[PDB]
Design a binder for this molecule. Structure first.
Ligand SMILES: [Mg+2]
Ligand SMILES: [Mg+2]
Ligand SMILES: [Mg+2]
Ligand SMILES: [Mg+2]
Ligand SMILES: [Mg+2]
Ligand SMILES: [Mg+2]
Ligand SMILES: [Mg+2]
Ligand SMILES: [Mg+2]
Ligand SMILES: [Mg+2]
Ligand SMILES: [Mg+2]
Ligand SMILES: [Mg+2]
Ligand SMILES: [Mg+2]
Ligand SMILES: [Mg+2]
Ligand SMILES: [Mg+2]
Ligand SMILES: [Mg+2]
Ligand SMILES: [Mg+2]
Ligand SMILES: [Mg+2]
Ligand SMILES: [Mg+2]
Ligand SMILES: [Mg+2]
Ligand SMILES: [Mg+2]
Ligand SMILES: [Mg+2]
Ligand SMILES: [Mg+2]
Ligand SMILES: [Mg+2]
Ligand SMILES: [Mg+2]
Ligand SMILES: [Mg+2]
Ligand SMILES: [Mg+2]
Ligand SMILES: [Mg+2]
Ligand SMILES: [Mg+2]
Ligand SMILES: [Mg+2]
Ligand SMILES: [Mg+2]
Ligand SMILES: [Mg+2]
Ligand SMILES: [Mg+2]
Ligand SMILES: [Mg+2]
Ligand SMILES: [Mg+2]
Ligand SMILES: [Mg+2]
Ligand SMILES: [Mg+2]
Ligand SMILES: [Mg+2]
Ligand SMILES: [Mg+2]
Ligand SMILES: [Mg+2]
Ligand SMILES: [Mg+2]
Ligand SMILES: [Mg+2]
Ligand SMILES: [Mg+2]
Ligand SMILES: [Mg+2]
Ligand SMILES: [Mg+2]
Ligand SMILES: [Mg+2]
Ligand SMILES: [Mg+2]
Ligand SMILES: [Mg+2]
Ligand SMILES: [Mg+2]
Ligand SMILES: [Mg+2]
Ligand SMILES: [Mg+2]
Ligand SMILES: [Mg+2]
Ligand SMILES: [Mg+2]
Ligand SMILES: [Mg+2]
Ligand SMILES: [Mg+2]
Ligand SMILES: [Mg+2]
Ligand SMILES: [Mg+2]
Ligand SMILES: [Mg+2]
Ligand SMILES: [Mg+2]
Ligand SMILES: [Mg+2]
Ligand SMILES: [Mg+2]
Ligand SMILES: [Mg+2]
Ligand SMILES: [Mg+2]
Ligand SMILES: [Mg+2]
Ligand SMILES: [Mg+2]
Ligand SMILES: [Mg+2]
Ligand SMILES: [Mg+2]
Ligand SMILES: [Mg+2]
Ligand SMILES: [Mg+2]
Ligand SMILES: [Mg+2]
Ligand SMILES: [Mg+2]
Ligand SMILES: [Mg+2]
Ligand SMILES: [Mg+2]
Ligand SMILES: [Mg+2]
Ligand SMILES: [Mg+2]
Ligand SMILES: [Mg+2]
Ligand SMILES: [Mg+2]
Ligand SMILES: [Mg+2]
Ligand SMILES: [Mg+2]
Ligand SMILES: [Mg+2]
Ligand SMILES: [Mg+2]
Ligand SMILES: [Mg+2]
Ligand SMILES: [Mg+2]
Ligand SMILES: [Mg+2]
Ligand SMILES: [Mg+2]
Ligand SMILES: [Mg+2]
Ligand SMILES: [Mg+2]
Ligand SMILES: [Mg+2]
Ligand SMILES: [Mg+2]
Ligand SMILES: [Mg+2]
Ligand SMILES: [Mg+2]
Ligand SMILES: [Mg+2]
Ligand SMILES: [Mg+2]
Ligand SMILES: [Mg+2]
Ligand SMILES: [Mg+2]
Ligand SMILES: [Mg+2]
Ligand SMILES: [Mg+2]
Ligand SMILES: [Mg+2]
Ligand SMILES: [Mg+2]
Ligand SMILES: [Mg+2]
Ligand SMILES: [Mg+2]
Ligand SMILES: [Mg+2]
Ligand SMILES: [Mg+2]
Ligand SMILES: [Mg+2]
Ligand SMILES: [Mg+2]
Ligand SMILES: [Mg+2]
Ligand SMILES: [Mg+2]
Ligand SMILES: [Mg+2]
Ligand SMILES: [Mg+2]
Ligand SMILES: [Mg+2]
Ligand SMILES: [Mg+2]
Ligand SMILES: [Mg+2]
Ligand SMILES: [Mg+2]
Ligand SMILES: [Mg+2]
Ligand SMILES: [Mg+2]
Ligand SMILES: [Mg+2]
Ligand SMILES: [Mg+2]
Ligand SMILES: [Mg+2]
Ligand SMILES: [Mg+2]
Ligand SMILES: [Mg+2]
Ligand SMILES: [Mg+2]
Ligand SMILES: [Mg+2]
Ligand SMILES: [Mg+2]
Ligand SMILES: [Mg+2]
Ligand SMILES: [Mg+2]
Ligand SMILES: [Mg+2]
Ligand SMILES: [Mg+2]
Ligand SMILES: [Mg+2]
Ligand SMILES: [Mg+2]
Ligand SMILES: [Mg+2]
Ligand SMILES: [Mg+2]
Ligand SMILES: [Mg+2]
Ligand SMILES: [Mg+2]
Ligand SMILES: [Mg+2]
Ligand SMILES: [Mg+2]
Ligand SMILES: [Mg+2]
Ligand SMILES: [Mg+2]
Ligand SMILES: [Mg+2]
Ligand SMILES: [Mg+2]
Ligand SMILES: [Mg+2]
Ligand SMILES: [Mg+2]
Ligand SMILES: [Mg+2]
Ligand SMILES: [Mg+2]
Ligand SMILES: [Mg+2]
Ligand SMILES: [Mg+2]
Ligand SMILES: [Mg+2]
Ligand SMILES: [Mg+2]
Ligand SMILES: [Mg+2]
Ligand SMILES: [Mg+2]
Ligand SMILES: [Mg+2]
Ligand SMILES: [Mg+2]
Ligand SMILES: [Mg+2]
Ligand SMILES: [Mg+2]
Ligand SMILES: [Mg+2]
Ligand SMILES: [Mg+2]
Ligand SMILES: [Mg+2]
Ligand SMILES: [Mg+2]
Ligand SMILES: [Mg+2]
Ligand SMILES: [Mg+2]
Ligand SMILES: [Mg+2]
Ligand SMILES: [Mg+2]
Ligand SMILES: [Mg+2]
Ligand SMILES: [Mg+2]
Ligand SMILES: [Mg+2]
Ligand SMILES: [Mg+2]
Ligand SMILES: [Mg+2]
Ligand SMILES: [Mg+2]
Ligand SMILES: [Mg+2]
Ligand SMILES: [Mg+2]
Ligand SMILES: [Mg+2]
Ligand SMILES: [Mg+2]
Ligand SMILES: [Mg+2]
Ligand SMILES: [Mg+2]
Ligand SMILES: [Mg+2]
Ligand SMILES: [Mg+2]
Ligand SMILES: [Mg+2]
Ligand SMILES: [Mg+2]
Ligand SMILES: [Mg+2]
Ligand SMILES: [Mg+2]
Ligand SMILES: [Mg+2]
Ligand SMILES: [Mg+2]
Ligand SMILES: [Mg+2]
Ligand SMILES: [Mg+2]
Ligand SMILES: [Mg+2]
Ligand SMILES: [Mg+2]
Ligand SMILES: [Mg+2]
Ligand SMILES: [Mg+2]
Ligand SMILES: [Mg+2]
Ligand SMILES: [Mg+2]
Ligand SMILES: [Mg+2]
Ligand SMILES: [Mg+2]
Ligand SMILES: [Mg+2]
Ligand SMILES: [Mg+2]
Ligand SMILES: [Mg+2]
Ligand SMILES: [Mg+2]
Ligand SMILES: [Mg+2]
Ligand SMILES: [Mg+2]
Ligand SMILES: [Mg+2]
Ligand SMILES: [Mg+2]
Ligand SMILES: [Mg+2]
Ligand SMILES: [Mg+2]
Ligand SMILES: [Mg+2]
Ligand SMILES: [Mg+2]
Ligand SMILES: [Mg+2]
Ligand SMILES: [Mg+2]
Ligand SMILES: [Mg+2]
Ligand SMILES: [Mg+2]
Ligand SMILES: [Mg+2]
Ligand SMILES: [Mg+2]
Ligand SMILES: [Mg+2]
Ligand SMILES: [Mg+2]
Ligand SMILES: [Mg+2]
Ligand SMILES: [Mg+2]
Ligand SMILES: [Mg+2]
Ligand SMILES: [Mg+2]
Ligand SMILES: [Mg+2]
Ligand SMILES: [Mg+2]
Ligand SMILES: [Mg+2]
Ligand SMILES: [Mg+2]
Ligand SMILES: [Mg+2]
Ligand SMILES: [Mg+2]
Ligand SMILES: [Mg+2]
Ligand SMILES: [Mg+2]
Ligand SMILES: [Mg+2]
Ligand SMILES: [Mg+2]
Ligand SMILES: [Mg+2]
Ligand SMILES: [Mg+2]
Ligand SMILES: [Mg+2]
Ligand SMILES: [Mg+2]
Ligand SMILES: [Mg+2]
Ligand SMILES: [Mg+2]
Ligand SMILES: [Mg+2]
Ligand SMILES: [Mg+2]
Ligand SMILES: [Mg+2]
Ligand SMILES: [Mg+2]
Ligand SMILES: [Mg+2]
Ligand SMILES: [Mg+2]
Ligand SMILES: [Mg+2]
Ligand SMILES: [Mg+2]
Ligand SMILES: [Mg+2]
Ligand SMILES: [Mg+2]
Ligand SMILES: [Mg+2]
Ligand SMILES: [Mg+2]
Ligand SMILES: [Mg+2]
Ligand SMILES: [Mg+2]
Ligand SMILES: [Mg+2]
Ligand SMILES: [Mg+2]
Ligand SMILES: [Mg+2]
Ligand SMILES: [Mg+2]
Ligand SMILES: [Mg+2]
Ligand SMILES: [Mg+2]
Ligand SMILES: [Mg+2]
Ligand SMILES: [Mg+2]
Ligand SMILES: [Mg+2]
Ligand SMILES: [Mg+2]
Ligand SMILES: [Mg+2]
Ligand SMILES: [Zn+2]
Lengths: 64, 107, 149, 100
RNA sequence: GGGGGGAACCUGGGGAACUGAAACAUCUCAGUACCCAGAGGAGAGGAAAGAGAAAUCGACUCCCUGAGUAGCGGCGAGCGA
RNA sequence: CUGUUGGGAAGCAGCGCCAGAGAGGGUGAAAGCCCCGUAGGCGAAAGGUGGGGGGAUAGGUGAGGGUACCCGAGUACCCCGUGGUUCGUGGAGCCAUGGGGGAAUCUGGGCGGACCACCGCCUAAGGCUAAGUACUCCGGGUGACCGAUAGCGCACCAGUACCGUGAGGGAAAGGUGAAAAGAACCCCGGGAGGGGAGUGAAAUAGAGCCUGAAACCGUGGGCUUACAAGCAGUCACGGCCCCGAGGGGUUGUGGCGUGCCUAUUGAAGCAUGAGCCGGCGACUCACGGUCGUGGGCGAGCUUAAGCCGUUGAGGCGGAGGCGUAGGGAAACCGAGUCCGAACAGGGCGCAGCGGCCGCAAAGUCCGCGGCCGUGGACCCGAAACCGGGC
RNA sequence: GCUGGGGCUAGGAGUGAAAAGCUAACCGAGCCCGGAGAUAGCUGGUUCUCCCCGAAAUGACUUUAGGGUCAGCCUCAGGCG
RNA sequence: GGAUGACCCCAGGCGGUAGGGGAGCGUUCCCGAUGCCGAUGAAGGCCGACCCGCGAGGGCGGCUGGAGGUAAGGGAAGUGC
RNA sequence: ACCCGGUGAAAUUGAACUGGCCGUGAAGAUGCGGCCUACCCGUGGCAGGACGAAAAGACCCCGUGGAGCUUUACUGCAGCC
């Protein structure tokens, strides 16, 4: 049978134009009152995954 | 349905193969089951017999061996040559075996 | 040339790797699997693309993002595929979505929107949308933009 | 391409021959054998005969050294198998259509 | 007229567990295995109180594609038009 | 058809012949022409079938105006509890319905994902309906399917023998020879068995029968061994025996020397497995994916089901899939986009080789290979769990 | 009290002057066939030849500790020099 | 050096478990094959102190055996205990 | 039980050309070292060794293995209100 897309990956992550893997930064889902504005602001950006853990995730999205 | 026999008791046949190749003889018996014939004076074997009321003193008797039917060919009672057999429909309209060299009946 | 002269090129048909076939093969006994452990077993390990030995996975510690949508699912709206001016240089006269369907430039059931990479060529091109730069370039180059809905 | 090259190979070899018609061959094998001789086919070389004329195919078919084809049946394994290619003009036309 | 039989195939009435979730309970296996009732050379379905956006199509069945898409999901494992 | 070899011609030789037939099986060996067949044709009084061809029959058929009679009831509908759908209570519609309440007949009623309005679609609560689809007890055809431990559990008198109270379990076992010509008869023996004779091309083809490997047991022959300390060998030398400046066999003495496998930090190990021999026995296949590779085409590449043709002949089929553009949760914009008040700053994106030709290449298609995913997924092994029966 | 014949009660069920005793020579849950090739991070086994290279037994995290993910160390192909 | 596996000369490397890579041997089957080897003896079996190959093996010869076997080059696996 | 005639098993078994001591060795050696002792082969006997045989330790730990039992463990169900 043809493979199935891992949906929890599809909902968290994106394969960029060159095949990098990008995600929202972790750590401001909550507990934010005592964090700086610098913490919050930076954590609002996307980041790029380390080569190994990124290569694993692309395999779970084989029809993107 | 039934075994095909191009030869029957007792038309005359040439043995065209084996140790008796070229001999001519009458078809003594046809054994469709084994697909073999018995040709008079051909394929003689020596069989031993026990001393009995049939054969007291005993010793041996001579017997004709069965020959594979393919090894035998009917001779045309018209032209006198060994031939393959054809069939022909008459007016009856029964069918008969006929010589392929000339149109002879083979019965 | 005859049948016995038919050959694959060198490299075209390669032999398979056969394990578990004697000492001298270099693949004997354990069949390149090492000693013991889950991996050596028939059935092997859990999907290494995801599983990490029981700790929360890399993937599952990242936050989800954006609209995923609800039943009854996708909302049917008109879709736009862009095609560049440079892609249009091959044609003469008039170009319309169906033409660029045939030439295998635009995918079916998609609305044409002309974009600006390349040059403009004095064509009468008919689309559902143009980019600002494609509009200028094409008007400037003696072409004739034609708008559909 | 395979179909083109297969024929092209036999041409470069001087082994390709196109024929206009098949004389008096009207279904009897001995007729083909006659015609064969007139065209250089003794049967020291195996031939792939390609024609749409059934009666020619039926004549030539039982031969050990002849393989027979209708032109839509032209295929490269059959081309390579045989030492000589023999095609009706009618056939050569349809072979032309399939390669262009 | 009925009864009973028939290798699989079919419909309907009932309907598990191991297992998977590297524990487990929702979930999975799966409406599967199996039990029962009925059909028949097939069975089911079938001439719109339909589709769902085409200002459109036009009974049903079956294959390909749509598509592992849309979605569903301790949004886990997975399930999946 | 003749010759020749041979037990046997179909082998070899010589001279022919058929072919819409040179598929294949047989015949004493290897046969187009000996046999059975094959190509191409022919055939049913009777029974079955008959979707095709013909014919009958049932059944089918107008337009305005008026009337407001009828248009499927414990039904629609609403609420409670559930099931079905991709939908697990979710904004939860739809279809179905166990309980409760309970209509209307076209100015009627259901649906278009809560609901409302607007705009459309459709006609619930009666029934039937070929074909296209599924299966293989049965018959036939064909195999880069097995060949007696294989192939069905069964090639053989097998669901048997045998095991079990029963449900149920469930084997082993094929081959003389071309032809029985299956060995008259005599001899030893109670018989079995054998020795002669005989048959046969062959009898270590004799029925306890093709081939007849190995473990294993025996007879005969060479070499060798009863003061010798051994993972059994090896290296050296010498003696004896065989074959004919060399080899082979044997081994007296001397030197050296801790089985194999598995598992382990480490085994000769007093750690595992193995009596020995023979045969069976473990990394595969399908579909996806990812790298590499051999080729076809290249801003393009490619078809799936199907249809036509073949009967080991290929073609058609462009639906669809991948690629050609990205950024953004999205609206949206687009070689840019997102964040932002920003023309700031950032994230993620954007740009061949030679003389128009060649050459290469994005990409894509197919073959091959490594590895991954889903399947039992390298083979064997649980204790258990569940269903129906006994 | 013992005993013949004829009967009834059985699998989470019977029966038990109670021993988890007995339910067809192994009962803390019978036997048979099926789901089934259950699952086994465990043990055993894994079959021809030659040539080149050639480890690890660490760190992080882990209901993890004799199993894994990534890193470390090995190997092949392409590129750099 | 010759010019690209033609061979020659010179120099260096070549212990090895897990494991990576490379090159080969053989078994069954298909194309080659309406061919070719085969009763003046197929396969298989028993020998050999002979030949070729590093090796897996491949030849050759004698005996057994009595009807099959299958090349160069390629294809495919129920392929080596 | 022994001897003679008759019939004739078994578990086990890597192969065996299977001595003592002091040592050594994965820590208790017929098999390694040094020494000592020892002609070849049986029969009836005895049980100290071959970590003798038999039973993939029944104790212990380990496995995110199972099963029976408990309860103010969790979550359900029958039953009852
Ligand atoms: Mg966050
Ligand atoms: Mg949180
Ligand atoms: Mg937030
Ligand atoms: Mg929030
Ligand atoms: Mg602070
Ligand atoms: Mg601050
Ligand atoms: Mg703050
Ligand atoms: Mg902010
Ligand atoms: Mg896609
Ligand atoms: Mg894409
Ligand atoms: Mg007849
Ligand atoms: Mg003859
Ligand atoms: Mg004669
Ligand atoms: Mg009659
Ligand atoms: Mg291959
Ligand atoms: Mg290799
Ligand atoms: Mg193996
Ligand atoms: Mg090997
Ligand atoms: Mg290797
Ligand atoms: Mg190795
Ligand atoms: Mg292993
Ligand atoms: Mg490996
Ligand atoms: Mg591996
Ligand atoms: Mg292992
Ligand atoms: Mg290890
Ligand atoms: Mg192992
Ligand atoms: Mg280990
Ligand atoms: Mg491992
Ligand atoms: Mg282990
Ligand atoms: Mg295992
Ligand atoms: Mg398994
Ligand atoms: Mg496993
Ligand atoms: Mg944890
Ligand atoms: Mg989406
Ligand atoms: Mg819907
Ligand atoms: Mg103009
Ligand atoms: Mg030929
Ligand atoms: Mg031919
Ligand atoms: Mg009934
Ligand atoms: Mg019935
Ligand atoms: Mg049902
Ligand atoms: Mg019912
Ligand atoms: Mg049900
Ligand atoms: Mg139940
Ligand atoms: Mg469960
Ligand atoms: Mg399972
Ligand atoms: Mg799983
Ligand atoms: Mg589990
Ligand atoms: Mg688990
Ligand atoms: Mg548990
Ligand atoms: Mg469970
Ligand atoms: Mg499962
Ligand atoms: Mg279900
Ligand atoms: Mg059912
Ligand atoms: Mg079933
Ligand atoms: Mg019935
Ligand atoms: Mg049908
Ligand atoms: Mg019906
Ligand atoms: Mg109707
Ligand atoms: Mg699509
Ligand atoms: Mg999720
Ligand atoms: Mg389901
Ligand atoms: Mg003679
Ligand atoms: Mg002759
Ligand atoms: Mg001749
Ligand atoms: Mg033919
Ligand atoms: Mg033939
Ligand atoms: Mg034949
Ligand atoms: Mg014979
Ligand atoms: Mg011949
Ligand atoms: Mg032959
Ligand atoms: Mg023949
Ligand atoms: Mg016919
Ligand atoms: Mg016929
Ligand atoms: Mg009217
Ligand atoms: Mg009314
Ligand atoms: Mg109605
Ligand atoms: Mg009613
Ligand atoms: Mg409603
Ligand atoms: Mg409801
Ligand atoms: Mg539900
Ligand atoms: Mg929800
Ligand atoms: Mg719903
Ligand atoms: Mg509504
Ligand atoms: Mg309702
Ligand atoms: Mg109701
Ligand atoms: Mg109303
Ligand atoms: Mg209305
Ligand atoms: Mg309704
Ligand atoms: Mg609707
Ligand atoms: Mg709506
Ligand atoms: Mg509607
Ligand atoms: Mg019906
Ligand atoms: Mg019809
Ligand atoms: Mg029907
Ligand atoms: Mg039908
Ligand atoms: Mg059949
Ligand atoms: Mg065979
Ligand atoms: Mg057998
Ligand atoms: Mg058998
Ligand atoms: Mg045999
Ligand atoms: Mg049978
Ligand atoms: Mg029997
Ligand atoms: Mg019993
Ligand atoms: Mg019995
Ligand atoms: Mg049983
Ligand atoms: Mg048997
Ligand atoms: Mg025989
Ligand atoms: Mg016989
Ligand atoms: Mg006598
Ligand atoms: Mg006597
Ligand atoms: Mg006797
Ligand atoms: Mg005697
Ligand atoms: Mg005798
Ligand atoms: Mg004689
Ligand atoms: Mg002879
Ligand atoms: Mg012999
Ligand atoms: Mg013999
Ligand atoms: Mg015997
Ligand atoms: Mg024989
Ligand atoms: Mg014998
Ligand atoms: Mg014997
Ligand atoms: Mg022997
Ligand atoms: Mg002796
Ligand atoms: Mg002394
Ligand atoms: Mg001495
Ligand atoms: Mg010593
Ligand atoms: Mg010396
Ligand atoms: Mg010597
Ligand atoms: Mg010597
Ligand atoms: Mg020595
Ligand atoms: Mg040493
Ligand atoms: Mg030793
Ligand atoms: Mg040592
Ligand atoms: Mg060994
Ligand atoms: Mg081993
Ligand atoms: Mg072992
Ligand atoms: Mg161990
Ligand atoms: Mg140990
Ligand atoms: Mg240890
Ligand atoms: Mg030892
Ligand atoms: Mg020992
Ligand atoms: Mg032990
Ligand atoms: Mg041991
Ligand atoms: Mg152990
Ligand atoms: Mg044993
Ligand atoms: Mg032995
Ligand atoms: Mg063995
Ligand atoms: Mg593999
Ligand atoms: Mg590829
Ligand atoms: Mg191409
Ligand atoms: Mg796709
Ligand atoms: Mg920017
Ligand atoms: Mg940039
Ligand atoms: Mg190219
Ligand atoms: Mg390419
Ligand atoms: Mg691949
Ligand atoms: Mg590998
Ligand atoms: Mg991989
Ligand atoms: Mg499976
Ligand atoms: Mg498997
Ligand atoms: Mg696998
Ligand atoms: Mg098992
Ligand atoms: Mg049990
Ligand atoms: Mg339980
Ligand atoms: Mg239970
Ligand atoms: Mg049960
Ligand atoms: Mg039961
Ligand atoms: Mg009484
Ligand atoms: Mg009584
Ligand atoms: Mg009684
Ligand atoms: Mg009683
Ligand atoms: Mg009772
Ligand atoms: Mg009872
Ligand atoms: Mg009862
Ligand atoms: Mg019962
Ligand atoms: Mg029970
Ligand atoms: Mg209980
Ligand atoms: Mg239970
Ligand atoms: Mg109870
Ligand atoms: Mg009592
Ligand atoms: Mg019992
Ligand atoms: Mg008992
Ligand atoms: Mg239990
Ligand atoms: Mg019992
Ligand atoms: Mg059953
Ligand atoms: Mg299952
Ligand atoms: Mg399994
Ligand atoms: Mg388990
Ligand atoms: Mg376990
Ligand atoms: Mg090295
Ligand atoms: Mg460590
Ligand atoms: Mg960590
Ligand atoms: Mg922790
Ligand atoms: Mg560890
Ligand atoms: Mg473990
Ligand atoms: Mg790693
Ligand atoms: Mg390094
Ligand atoms: Mg690497
Ligand atoms: Mg390199
Ligand atoms: Mg050197
Ligand atoms: Mg080197
Ligand atoms: Mg080495
Ligand atoms: Mg290499
Ligand atoms: Mg082999
Ligand atoms: Mg090979
Ligand atoms: Mg075959
Ligand atoms: Mg052939
Ligand atoms: Mg042949
Ligand atoms: Mg010859
Ligand atoms: Mg002979
Ligand atoms: Mg001979
Ligand atoms: Mg052979
Ligand atoms: Mg063979
Ligand atoms: Mg040899
Ligand atoms: Mg031989
Ligand atoms: Mg033959
Ligand atoms: Mg071959
Ligand atoms: Mg070959
Ligand atoms: Mg080929
Ligand atoms: Mg195998
Ligand atoms: Mg005495
Ligand atoms: Mg005695
Ligand atoms: Mg020894
Ligand atoms: Mg001794
Ligand atoms: Mg010590
Ligand atoms: Mg001690
Ligand atoms: Mg020891
Ligand atoms: Mg000691
Ligand atoms: Mg000693
Ligand atoms: Mg020693
Ligand atoms: Mg030493
Ligand atoms: Mg000693
Ligand atoms: Mg001493
Ligand atoms: Mg004694
Ligand atoms: Mg003792
Ligand atoms: Mg004792
Ligand atoms: Mg004693
Ligand atoms: Mg002792
Ligand atoms: Mg000892
Ligand atoms: Mg002891
Ligand atoms: Mg022991
Ligand atoms: Mg005992
Ligand atoms: Mg015991
Ligand atoms: Mg065990
Ligand atoms: Mg144990
Ligand atoms: Mg035990
Ligand atoms: Mg234990
Ligand atoms: Mg312990
Ligand atoms: Mg425990
Ligand atoms: Mg736990
Ligand atoms: Mg654990
Ligand atoms: Mg447990
Ligand atoms: Mg339990
Ligand atoms: Mg009560
Ligand atoms: Zn005549």
């Amino acid at each position: 049978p043809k493979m199935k897309t891992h949906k929890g990956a599809k909902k968290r992550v994106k394969i960029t134009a060159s095949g990098k893997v990008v995600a929202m930064k972790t750590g401001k889902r909550h507990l934010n009152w005592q964090k700086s504005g610098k913490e919050i602001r930076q954590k609002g950006r996307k980041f790029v995954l380390a080569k190994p853990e990124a290569e694993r995730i692309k395999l779970l999205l084989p029809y993107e | 349905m039934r075994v095909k026999m191009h030869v029957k008791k007792g038309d005359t046949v040439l043995v065209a193969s084996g140790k008796y190749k070229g001999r001519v003889g009458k078809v003594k018996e046809v054994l469709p089951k084994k697909y073999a014939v018995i040709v008079e004076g051909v394929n003689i074997v020596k069989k031993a017999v026990r001393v009995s009321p049939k054969y007291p003193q005993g010793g041996f008797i001579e017997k004709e061996a069965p020959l594979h039917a393919s090894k035998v060919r009917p001779i045309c009672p018209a032209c006198g040559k060994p031939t393959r057999v054809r069939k022909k429909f008459l007016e009856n309209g029964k069918k008969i075996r006929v010589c392929a060299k000339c149109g002879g009946a083979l019965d | 040339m005859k049948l016995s002269d038919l050959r694959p090129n060198p490299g075209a048909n390669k032999r398979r790797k056969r394990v578990g076939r004697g000492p001298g093969s270099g693949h004997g006994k354990t069949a390149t699997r090492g000693h013991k452990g889950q991996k050596s077993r028939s059935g092997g390990l859990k999907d290494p693309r995801r599983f990490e030995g029981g700790r929360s996975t890399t993937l599952m510690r990242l936050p989800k993002r954006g609209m995923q949508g609800q039943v009854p699912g996708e909302i049917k709206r008109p879709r736009y595929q862009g095609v560049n001016l440079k892609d249009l240089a091959r044609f003469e006269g008039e170009v319309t979505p169906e033409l660029l369907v045939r030439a295998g430039l635009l995918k079916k059931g998609y609305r044409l929107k002309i974009l600006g990479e390349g040059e403009a060529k004095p064509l009468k091109v008919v689309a559902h949308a143009f980019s600002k730069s494609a509009l200028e370039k094409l008007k400037a180059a003696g072409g004739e933009p034609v708008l559909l809905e | 391409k395979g179909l083109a090259m297969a024929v092209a190979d036999r041409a470069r070899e001087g082994k390709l021959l196109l024929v206009e018609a098949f004389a008096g061959v009207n279904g009897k094998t001995k007729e083909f054998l006659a015609w064969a001789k007139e065209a250089g086919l003794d049967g020291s070389e195996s031939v792939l005969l390609v024609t749409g004329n059934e009666l020619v195919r039926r004549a030539a078919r039982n031969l050990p050294w002849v393989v027979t084809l209708a032109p839509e049946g032209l295929n490269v394994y059959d081309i390579v198998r045989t030492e000589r290619l023999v095609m009706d003009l009618d056939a050569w036309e349809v072979f032309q259509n399939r390669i262009g």
